[PDB]
Design a protein around this ligand. Structure first.
Ligand SMILES: OC[C@H]1O[C@@H](O)[C@H](O)[C@H](O[C@@H]2O[C@H]3CO[C@@H]([C@@H]2O)[C@@H]3O[C@@H]2O[C@H](CO)[C@H](O)[C@H](O[C@@H]3O[C@H]4CO[C@@H]([C@@H]3O)[C@@H]4O[C@@H]3O[C@H](CO)[C@H](O)[C@H](O[C@@H]4O[C@H]5CO[C@@H]([C@@H]4O)[C@@H]5O)[C@H]3O)[C@H]2O)[C@H]1O
Ligand code: CA
Ligand code: CA
Ligand code: CL
Ligand code: CL
Ligand code: CL
Length: 138
């Protein structure tokens, strides 16, 4: 029942958000030290991903995330029949914008099938976090 699904944060299907950050898109892509990541993530911004899951299970979520402020949090949601369902919310340690560190994001039950997942800038700060990737492990 072991399984591992790595998702590159830059590989979102769509991004969204109201915060006026002056960029072409509400969330942007950059590279640092060979790591391609999303940045300019503000409060209320989000990134959507479509994920195929062959093996049903209670997956553990790990993020390769950094932040340069206090009050950034990653909320992981799944779109369940046209309504977003909040799964976990994880504060991101303030250890530097480009300093990605493994971050435990809790667990989420995923059935065998295809899931729309959203990562949302849920924290209190105007500025939230940068993200290299996340992994779902069973
Ligand atoms: O004698 C007094 C008077 O003197 C006059 O000469 C002055 O004009 C003065 O006026 C004051 O001046 C300052 C002090 O009080 C206010 C007053 O007007 C004024 O305060 C400043 O106001 C600015 C707007 O005009 C700003 O708000 C400024 O705050 C800063 O603005 C920028 C720069 O540093 C940050 C700070 O908030 C902010 O930058 C953003 O910071 C984020 C972290 O908080 C983050 O780094 C953002 O960048 C992102 O970082 C990572 C995630 O995504 C990317 C992205 O680049 C990257 O990977 C960053 O943009 C405020 O101090 C008279 O009183
Ligand atoms: Ca933004
Ligand atoms: Ca990446
Ligand atoms: Cl990917
Ligand atoms: Cl939680
Ligand atoms: Cl769950």
């Amino acid at each position: 029942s072991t399984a591992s699904i790595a998702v590159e944060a830059e590989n979102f299907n769509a991004v969204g958000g109201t915060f006026s950050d002056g960029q072409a898109q509400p969330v942007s892509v950059y590279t640092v030290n060979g790591n391609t990541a999303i940045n300019y993530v503000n409060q209320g911004d989000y990134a959507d991903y479509t994920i195929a899951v062959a093996q049903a299970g209670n997956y553990t979520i790990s993020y390769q995330a950094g932040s340069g402020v206090t009050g950034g949090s990653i909320e992981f949601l799944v779109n369940e029949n046209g309504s977003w369902a909040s799964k976990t919310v994880t504060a991101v340690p303030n250890q530097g914008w480009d300093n990605f560190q493994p971050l435990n994001g809790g667990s989420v039950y995923l059935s065998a099938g295809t899931h729309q997942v959203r990562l949302h800038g849920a924290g209190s700060n105007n500025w939230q976090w940068n993200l290299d990737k996340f992994t779902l492990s069973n």
